Amino acid sequence: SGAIYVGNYRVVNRHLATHNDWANLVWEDSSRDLLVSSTTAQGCDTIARCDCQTGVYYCSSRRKHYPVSFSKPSLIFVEASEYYPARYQSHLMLAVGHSEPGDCGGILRCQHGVVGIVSTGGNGLVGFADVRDLLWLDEE
Ligand SMILES: CC(=O)Nc1ccccc1CC(=O)N1CCC[C@H](C(N)=O)C1
Ligand SMILES: [Zn+2]
């Protein structure tokens, strides 16, 4: 589990969105596994606007933050899960790291801010949904 809290937005994995998220929806994209809802309180996270390919992510199944090298956002085939069939997910970045399904929502960050959230996982792989292109998260 986990979310990004920037401005008056809450960014979560679409497959983990709650009823309150759907009832206060701002934007969602199944191809990216992302959903954004509105919040009453202002958040403290800032979004990275950069081209970093190194950063650190939070792994809830180890209670640890790990430094990782990650690929550029791309269209990757992901195997079936209980939330989606086997399909192509867009704006996904892969790294070598520990991951389990409940680790979705953990933040990937660099020196500039938040880069994305854990969305997928393989044997010794972790995939992150990028948010750096979502410029509108910084306003309204
Ligand atoms: C075996 C493993 O590492 N599982 C793992 C770890 C961490 C997170 C997720 C998984 C499995 C996974 O990739 N998916 C299940 C949840 C929805 C994902 C999606 N965005 O399409 C696909
Ligand atoms: Zn950066």
| Any ligand 1 atom below 6 A from CB of 16 | no
Q: Is the torsion defined by CA of 63, 44, 91, 81 positive or negative?
A: positive
User: Taking a C-beta distance cutoff of 8 angstroms, is the pair 1, 102 a contact?
Assistant: yes
If you measure from the C-alpha of residue 73 to the centroid of ligand 1, how many angstroms do you get, rounded to a whole number? 17
**Separation of alpha carbons 11 and 48, rounded Å:** 14
The rounded Å distance from CA 140 to ligand 1 centre is 32
> Whose Cα sits closest to atom 18 in ligand 1?
120
Q: Which residues pair with 54 in a beta bridge?
A: 69
- Assess whether the C-beta atom of 120 lies below 6 angstroms from ligand 1: yes
Name, in order, each residue with C-beta under 8 angstroms of 100's C-beta and a sequence gap of 6 or more. Answer: 61, 121
Sign of CA dihedral 85, 86, 89, 94: positive
- Choice among 21, 59, 91, 104 that is catalytic: 104
- Given a contact cutoff of 8 angstroms between Cβ atoms, the answer to whether 123 and 129 are in contact is no
CB 74 within 8 A of CB 128: no
Q: How far is Cα 36 from Cα 82, in angstroms, rounded to an integer?
A: 21
Q: What is the 3-state secondary structure (H, E, C) of the chain?
A: CCCEEEEEEEEEEHHHCCHHHHHCEEEEEHHHCEEEEEEEEEEECCECCCCCCEEEEEECCCCEEEEEECCCCEEEEECCCCCCCCEEEEEEEEEECCCCHHHCCCEEEECCEEEEEEEEEECCEEEEEECCCCHHHHCC
**How far is Cα of residue 57 from the mean position of the Cα atoms in its chain?**
10
Experimental method of this PDB entry: X-ray
Resolution (Å) of this entry? 1.2
